[PDB]
Amino acid sequence: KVVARVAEARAEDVGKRVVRVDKAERAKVGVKVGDVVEVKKV
Amino acid sequence: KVVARVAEARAEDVGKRVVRVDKAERAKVGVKVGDVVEVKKV
Known part of the structure; x- marks a missing residue:
């Protein structure tokens, strides 16, 4: 899981x-820049 | 799924x-601001 602070x-x-x-x-x-990612709550 | 362009x-x-x-x-x-989220490739 790649996780980060919002x-x-x-x-x-x-x-x-x-x-x-x-x-x-x-x-x-x-x-890469311009790709689509999902952002979800952990 | 919440999705966004990088x-x-x-x-x-x-x-x-x-x-x-x-x-x-x-x-x-x-x-909210300061929460931790996951960023994953779709």
Whole structure:
């Protein structure tokens, strides 16, 4: 399971159906920028 | 399933084990800021 702490969106991202993930967690999930991921409560 | 497109972290968030999610997707997942979520590939 790749897990992370949720933080608020920056102003310029409000309204987007988007999650910001740095390179390290993208590598752990095995996705690239622009891929679709699921975000679920643990 | 709550799903979203992955975008790169902003500079100031690099190195954090953190995902940025706006209010709308937090409400759909049913989490608040600071909660832990799972991010998985669909």
